[PDB]
Amino acid sequence: WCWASYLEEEKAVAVPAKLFKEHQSFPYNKNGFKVGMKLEGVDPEHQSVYCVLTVAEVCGYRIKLHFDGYSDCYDFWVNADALDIHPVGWCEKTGHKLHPPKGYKEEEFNWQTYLKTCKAQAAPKSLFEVIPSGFRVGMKLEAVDKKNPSFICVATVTDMVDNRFLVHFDNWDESYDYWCEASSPHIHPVGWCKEHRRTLITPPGYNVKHFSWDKYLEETNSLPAPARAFKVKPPHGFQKKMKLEVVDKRNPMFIRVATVADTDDHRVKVHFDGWNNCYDYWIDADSPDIHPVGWCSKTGHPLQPPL
Amino acid sequence: WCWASYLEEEKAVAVPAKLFKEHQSFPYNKNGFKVGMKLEGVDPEHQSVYCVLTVAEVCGYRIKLHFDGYSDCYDFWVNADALDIHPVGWCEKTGHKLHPPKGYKEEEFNWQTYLKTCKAQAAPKSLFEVIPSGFRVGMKLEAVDKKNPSFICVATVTDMVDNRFLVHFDNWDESYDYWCEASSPHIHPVGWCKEHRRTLITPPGYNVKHFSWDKYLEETNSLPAPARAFKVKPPHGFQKKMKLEVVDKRNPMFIRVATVADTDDHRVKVHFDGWNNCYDYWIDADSPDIHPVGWCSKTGHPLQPPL
Ligand SMILES: c1cc(N2CCC(N3CCCC3)CC2)ccc1CCN1CCCC1
Ligand SMILES: c1cc(N2CCC(N3CCCC3)CC2)ccc1CCN1CCCC1
């Protein structure tokens, strides 16, 4: 099976590699991770929480991570250059809380003892990975609940690591938190909802009858994020019918031959060639899980042909 | 394509219809629901919340429900006899709160006005569907977080409809709530964790250093559920290699030819014939989404053959 041939047969073009951001395109590195190495990492379903993780599988430029002491059902795939993994010791060095393995309490855990207990090694620092901005921990803003994207709500930046920061919805469960960057289309400076005739969702258990950002910021002794820090996402250039390689959301070990079925400002609707259209789904055009044609061959990862 | 033949070729037996509970087996009714009818129903991701719903699709004995005013991305399939759908007016008749469509406030909503606005009809009462027990709203108990099943926690029965009741985790987000029955393997009478040397998770922001059910029940002026009400789930008889019809979790419009790959006391691991084993997954053996061979043919629903 060959992309060049397939592209000729289908009279179609590949999405140009140059439209993909660096985290999506060909890596300029081999995958050094080995099964059994241990590291720290963000829980994708509880994104404020850093956890103890073990590399459970290696495939091309991707690794499958396991939360020590928890069920394999929670195992997740990231790319070898993911931003939300960190070497052993990072939490302590950076002042962050590390959630211990299932069955330990914090006071029973540290890395030196745990590595001896497991007869295991930390993933070397050398395997892991700037542009300044006006976002600081503590600042408040208006953000889309990614799980319920019609709702825009009062949020706070609660953590920050280099160019990414963490959005939390004041008085809402942690599980709604997510990491993003200054250009995210999901975040808005205070009083953006006013200026656009949109409903701002206010914190549970609050003066909802006439809520005020000014009063709230004083009552919480907090600054707003400055409008100048909110940078603008330039549109992606992806076009319908262009082909690419996509991680199958529904079984993420596989990467599949895919087609751009539809677009909007910041997303593409992917379609797995050979499969029914009812499998198609939306994904951010900057996702690390979509790739230029040839990414699998270049990285050593198997590619699923059309069904 | 024919089950009888396939079963001969594969030298396999169907799971006996008689091992399936009434909500899984052949219905003794046609599907009267029509596209466009409106009703009330529980939100599967927010199970304490009753919502305004419209029938968006009809297929065999199943219906696909749409949350008025919200994205189609939230559409969900139930069986025509589901317990958690209700006719127009039920919430008001039963004293429950009805969440209005996206874009209405409660005070702007009632059914008579809304049906005139939409030029639409309620699903007749005749389309909708006893065994006494000692569970009452307000009672407390110990329950498994179904999303994090290693954790057993302080919970409260917060709602009750005939034989089902709703479990809520005290001081935790509503999204963790779920409906169940008196025989659920996920619920336990107070001090079951003591009697089994298990850690009870206590409510956020509580005397965790030496938590007491007795003190807590007085401080909340609440009764415990009596041990006598906790009935016992008899094991299912499903055996490996037996065949059945299963709703595809990952694309629930489809029902597929399936095989029991593994079992435990209350679950079966289903496998879609023709597909890679990495698609297999666990499901409660009493789920309304698994069915006896021939269920699709009897009900008018298409059946996906093996890949
Ligand atoms: C249930 C839950 C919610 N919310 C969940 C919480 C949500 N966010 C939590 C983080 C900021 C706001 C705010 C809205 C809104 C409406 C419902 C009931 C209607 N269903 C929700 C999706 C399908 C319809
Ligand atoms: C994150 C969240 C939680 N919880 C989420 C809340 C949960 N339940 C809420 C309803 C009752 C208890 C209690 C445990 C536990 C551990 C973590 C971090 C570790 N990851 C969780 C699943 C994979 C590892």
XYZ file of N, CA and C and ligand atoms in Angstrom, chain A residues 43 45-46 49-51 67-68 70-71 74 99-100 173-174, chain B residues 143-148 151-154 169-170 172-173 176-177 201, ligand 2:
120
model
N -2.788 14.109 34.141
C -3.911 13.207 33.861
C -4.817 13.879 32.841
N -7.813 13.463 32.040
C -9.201 13.643 32.481
C -9.287 14.488 33.740
N -8.133 14.795 34.325
C -8.047 15.611 35.538
C -6.797 16.468 35.434
N -3.956 17.633 37.780
C -3.280 16.637 38.595
C -2.080 16.047 37.874
N -0.916 16.105 38.516
C 0.246 15.410 38.003
C 0.354 14.039 38.669
N 0.636 13.026 37.869
C 0.631 11.654 38.304
C 1.949 10.923 38.030
N -0.955 4.647 34.468
C -0.952 5.295 35.790
C -0.654 4.212 36.824
N 0.522 4.231 37.445
C 0.905 3.156 38.401
C -0.166 2.956 39.467
N -3.186 1.902 38.982
C -4.549 2.010 38.501
C -4.750 1.020 37.396
N -6.005 0.805 37.039
C -6.373 -0.068 35.934
C -5.757 0.372 34.599
N -7.258 3.087 32.031
C -6.871 4.492 31.993
C -5.643 4.793 31.124
N 0.738 13.458 42.569
C -0.205 12.492 43.055
C 0.498 11.143 43.051
N 0.513 10.450 44.199
C 1.209 9.167 44.264
C 0.443 8.057 43.588
N -16.122 21.710 39.551
C -15.258 20.552 39.655
C -13.991 20.705 38.788
N -12.862 20.322 39.364
C -11.576 20.219 38.682
C -11.579 19.481 37.342
N -20.985 3.636 48.041
C -21.161 3.285 46.622
C -19.896 3.474 45.819
N -19.751 2.646 44.792
C -18.599 2.723 43.887
C -18.801 3.887 42.915
N -17.817 4.763 42.793
C -17.783 5.690 41.684
C -17.603 4.910 40.364
N -18.642 4.828 39.541
C -18.589 4.007 38.327
C -17.525 4.489 37.369
N -17.197 5.771 37.416
C -16.105 6.304 36.583
C -14.703 6.070 37.137
N -14.626 5.753 38.415
C -13.368 5.492 39.083
C -13.636 4.367 40.089
N -12.624 3.439 43.866
C -13.034 4.294 44.969
C -14.460 4.020 45.419
N -14.625 3.766 46.721
C -15.940 3.534 47.313
C -16.191 4.646 48.280
N -17.369 5.258 48.172
C -17.567 6.550 48.792
C -18.935 6.719 49.442
N -18.954 7.717 50.319
C -20.123 8.169 51.024
C -21.119 8.762 50.038
N -22.891 11.361 45.290
C -21.750 11.379 46.201
C -21.667 12.721 46.905
N -21.805 12.667 48.220
C -21.959 13.849 49.046
C -20.765 14.740 48.805
N -19.643 16.012 46.076
C -18.993 15.824 44.794
C -19.929 16.319 43.702
N -19.331 16.704 42.580
C -20.072 17.140 41.414
C -21.195 16.148 41.047
N -21.136 12.860 38.644
C -20.836 11.509 39.130
C -22.069 10.672 39.572
N -23.252 11.291 39.666
C -24.508 10.613 39.989
C -24.880 9.523 39.003
N -13.978 6.508 50.951
C -13.692 7.884 50.596
C -14.734 8.759 51.261
C -8.008 11.961 39.744
C -9.310 11.959 40.253
C -9.723 11.051 41.232
N -11.010 10.993 41.724
C -12.154 11.667 41.002
C -13.295 11.896 41.868
C -13.705 10.512 42.410
N -15.153 10.295 42.772
C -16.132 11.384 42.526
C -17.370 10.630 42.948
C -16.944 9.871 44.204
C -15.437 9.803 44.132
C -12.737 10.288 43.470
C -11.390 9.998 42.800
C -8.754 10.145 41.662
C -7.449 10.155 41.175
C -7.051 11.053 40.193
C -5.742 11.083 39.684
C -5.337 9.696 39.086
N -6.005 9.341 37.828
C -7.459 9.034 37.939
C -7.824 7.923 36.933
C -6.466 7.595 36.327
C -5.451 8.076 37.360
